[PDB]
Scaffold this active site. Sequence first.
Site, PDB file in Angstrom:
ATOM      1  N   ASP A  37       0.765  -1.165  -0.121  1.00 41.64           N
ATOM      2  CA  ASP A  37       0.048   0.036   0.011  1.00 41.64           C
ATOM      3  C   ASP A  37       0.891   1.160   0.136  1.00 41.64           C
ATOM      4  O   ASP A  37       1.922   1.151  -0.433  1.00 41.64           O
ATOM      5  CB  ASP A  37      -0.825   0.007   1.231  1.00 41.64           C
ATOM      6  N   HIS A  70      -3.874   5.908   3.705  1.00 42.68           N
ATOM      7  CA  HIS A  70      -4.632   4.583   3.242  1.00 42.68           C
ATOM      8  C   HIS A  70      -4.007   3.666   3.765  1.00 42.68           C
ATOM      9  O   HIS A  70      -4.708   2.448   4.337  1.00 42.68           O
ATOM     10  CB  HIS A  70      -4.684   4.824   1.676  1.00 42.68           C
ATOM     11  N   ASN A 157     -14.192   0.016  -6.935  1.00 47.58           N
ATOM     12  CA  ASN A 157     -14.917   1.141  -6.411  1.00 47.58           C
ATOM     13  C   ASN A 157     -15.668   1.660  -7.514  1.00 47.58           C
ATOM     14  O   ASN A 157     -16.290   2.991  -7.363  1.00 47.58           O
ATOM     15  CB  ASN A 157     -14.517   2.014  -5.595  1.00 47.58           C
TER      16      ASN A 157
END
Length: 281
Positions: A37, A70, A157
């Site tokens: 990430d 995040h 998403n």
Amino acid sequence: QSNAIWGLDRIDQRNLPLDRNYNANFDGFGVTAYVIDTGVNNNHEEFGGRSVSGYDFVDNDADSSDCNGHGTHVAGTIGGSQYGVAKNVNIVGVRVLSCSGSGTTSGVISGVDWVAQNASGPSVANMSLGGGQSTALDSAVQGAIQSGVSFMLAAGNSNADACNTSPARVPSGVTVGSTTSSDSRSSFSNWGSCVDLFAPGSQIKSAWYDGGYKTISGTSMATPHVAGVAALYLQENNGLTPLQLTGLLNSRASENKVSDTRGTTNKLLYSLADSGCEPDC
Ligand SMILES: [Ca+2]
Ligand SMILES: [Ca+2]
Ligand SMILES: [Ca+2]
């Protein structure tokens, strides 16, 4: 424990209503979650020293600190003391996304390869990230999974078919769609045949890179619920291959609870060691 936030609250029970409790029989002790990430804030209070740097492929350095938020938030949902699933798991930062949250396909592959090469004991990897179809990234993830490390992947998403997103579409990955506390699929969640199950992803509270907290929504937030539970299953059974762990996520999942699945298998994450067929097995 009590006063539990809703995502945690949801995954230790079959049906609504929520009971404001997250019960657990395991905590990820002796298991390591690799967070691929934007980095992880190792000093965040949620980790109590259980987070360390892995490698930073954005800047080619040894410090996988997070300058976006995040990555830390995702790591917190896996392993944070107050807001995480597996409250004594080890966390390792594998930074492949910039402070803005962007990365390169090859930098992500390097992170994936690094996890395959460096995982030691019981391990799970979390990829709360995705983009256009890439056979090269798909192949690296498939390879790391063959190496023996289970991979949890965000569905995406776009309210679209997850099969058009890498790494989500990699069959042997566990690809995670998002729900709300009303048991609806989140309206933004990708959907379809490549999504293996749903987990809490709307309005999820967790750690932030500045040392505080943030509440956000995405399949990126659902995915670490699943990685968290993988860590619980790995503590229970250190020897699970990725095929075995996938099987168990499936067989333990709560069935037919989710609304607006839109062509996705109706399985919702369940954190506890018993089988979700128990209506009609
Ligand atoms: Ca509960
Ligand atoms: Ca760095
Ligand atoms: Ca799959």
